[PDB]
């Protein structure tokens, strides 16, 4: 019901507050990159899509959101070996235009793998 | 040959050499988002993909490069209708440890969809 | 005791720890941009003062750090009329090689004028 | 002419282009942070001068610029030994309400020093 590449990363959202959205996924044999680590771009989609979907709830029938910029660093090298992330976005500015969330995902310690800030743009009714 | 999700990505490299990486794909119906457009996390993994291509093609077998993080600017939207898109990593800075490089992806007529600047590190023999 | 250009920024540090800084500053008629706003660069500078003095104190005795990238968003004007901004640093990463910090600059009502990401490097003894 | 704060650093406009803006300037003493090397937001504030110049003069009469975020990258230590700087301004993208643009910042070799992306937002009236 989130479209088809967020089913193709296999996000389960948890929660999609107007303040918070959680979502938990694996690495797969399919998202690895050649050395057998997640491909950094899953990271980076990941970070997009919990964001987007906070960023929507928030925005609810107000208007539409739109991608403008996601920076993602990984911090941690990812594996099937490591079990099952949960993803978590946070507002960091919602305004008229703009919006801007930060997504921490980590895994089952705590230990934070990868971490992203999305800009996304209102377009209002 | 380049591993499982860049497969799944569709990217087809016409070149990778130690100093330019480029690569054709096209917007496909399981990339997109719930209205219609290219996911945003596709760019980011495009651009991930792209520039690591190009990092590695460098380092040779001098050593491995690991992501570190990826920046990517979403600039106009991409449609299936938009045809074929060309995504090309240009060098910014190679030295002993760090790797940064500038991927732009582009349509047919030169426009500018999508832009990405990723961090590497090189971990030498 | 922290250099010429804190100085001149007019930063005054109420806490350095290893996991947190926070120091408050001005705007001032000399650090504005034409319009009667703070100059933009401003902002950059006092979230890479405010993170680098408290990786620095993180790493104590262990090594230098040396400034690697510096993103910082402004999300509002700030005036001469605006008082006291307060910025605070958070640790996001703090590992062998690398530290990530978080900068988060308020005014007085808690309003986020600016937030800025600092990737440092360690070079340790 | 341009402010306060971009006199303060020194900053010498060679061209300031709809389509590129050029400005000189040296690493000073009350620029540097503790250990003798240029203080990151110096290259920060830089970057956002040098871009906005250019995109203030691609927009012209249209409207006013408003600075919305700075990313900039510091690659070599830059001291007073290193002379002369130049910061070259290169559009990235230039719509009806954003604006990208690139600096680099290169000593008298060629060498890149920083560079930065810099997204403002075109107030039109």
Redesign the interface.
Known sequence: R?????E??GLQFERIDPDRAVAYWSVR???????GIL????H??????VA?AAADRWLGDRG?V??????????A?ATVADGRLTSTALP??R?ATQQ?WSVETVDAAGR?VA?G?V?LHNLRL
Do not use: K
Not at 44 to 49: I, P, T
């Open positions: 989130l479209g088809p590449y967020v193709h990363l044999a399919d998202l690895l990159q050649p050395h491909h950094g771009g899953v980076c989609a990941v970070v997009e899509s987007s539409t739109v991608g403008v910029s996601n920076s993602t660093d990984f911090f090298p960091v500015h305004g801007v934070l971490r800030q800009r």
